[PDB]
């Protein structure tokens, strides 16, 4: 009878209670019941961070802020990945992301198995910028999540609009 505030006609997805974004209770097609909210929140945070970075990347490289090196000059955002994948640049970025994601795999596996007690999305980078106040810490986490969601939708937009209309730039 909790009646999730987002979709009023649906019952509250119970496992979302206590999590940072759970006060809105938006999980229709309730998947917190089938999938552990630890995994769902780790995936949400990973997508949000990747999109918060990819948005800025697309904007900066579409505006014309290419890196110093040649093989980075004159390459548009669209035909960029297929270019740096043959220049050897996407391989090393894949290596760095691979070690970061092996760290992520260890963290997710140990957390879901219950061995470690890290929080979902916590990679232990930071902890000296956290507001240190529990209400303020949860507020900062909610800011991260909301910005990540906005950035996910924004990058989806930006990318689709750019690739549908190649002769354009960031305002689209």
């Amino acid at each position: 009878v909790k009646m999730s505030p987002s979709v009023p006609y649906l019952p509250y997805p119970e496992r979302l209670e206590g999590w940072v974004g759970g006060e809105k209770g938006f999980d229709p097609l309730r998947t917190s019941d089938i999938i552990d909210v630890y995994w769902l929140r780790e995936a949400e945070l990973k997508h949000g961070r990747i999109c918060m970075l990819a948005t800025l990347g697309w904007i900066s490289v579409d505006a014309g802020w290419r890196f110093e090196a040649e093989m980075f000059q004159g390459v548009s955002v669209i035909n960029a990945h297929n270019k740096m994948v043959e220049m050897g640049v996407m391989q090393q970025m894949l290596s760095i992301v691979g070690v970061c994601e092996i760290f992520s795999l260890y963290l997710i596996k140990e957390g879901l198995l219950g061995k470690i007690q890290r929080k979902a999305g916590d990679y232990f980078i930071g902890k000296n910028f956290l507001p240190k106040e529990e209400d303020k810490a949860k507020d900062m986490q909610l800011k991260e999540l909301e910005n990540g969601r906005l950035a996910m939708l924004a990058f989806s937009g930006i990318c689709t609009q750019a690739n549908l209309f190649p002769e354009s730039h960031f305002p689209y």
């Binding site: 119970e14 496992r15 309730r30 019941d33 089938i34 092996i102 795999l105 596996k109 219950g114």
Partner: protein, 89 residues
């Protein structure tokens, strides 16, 4: 160069054409080995999990998910039974 053995190899005249280069270079072989190393680490984890079995607290201290609660209550997906049956319905 091979010495052909068997009547059909000689009759049909099929030739074992060696590729000029190798096919996987060395970098992609290294990537395959790295991915296999990750799979090996996961296999070690699975072996440790299975050899010591499931601990008694998990599935007893960890509350069942609402999906699992409703499935056990309504007897679905092999519950209300003592079988595995991946090809249930």
């Amino acid at each position: 160069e091979r010495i052909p053995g068997g009547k059909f190899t000689k009759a049909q005249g099929k030739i074992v054409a060696t590729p000029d280069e190798d096919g996987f270079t060395d970098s992609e072989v290294a990537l395959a080995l790295i991915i296999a190393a990750v799979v090996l680490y996961l296999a070690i984890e699975v072996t440790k999990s299975l050899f010591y079995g499931e601990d008694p607290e998990t599935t007893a201290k960890g509350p069942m998910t609402p999906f699992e609660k409703r499935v056990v209550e309504k007897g679905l997906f092999g519950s209300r039974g003592d079988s595995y049956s991946p090809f249930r319905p």
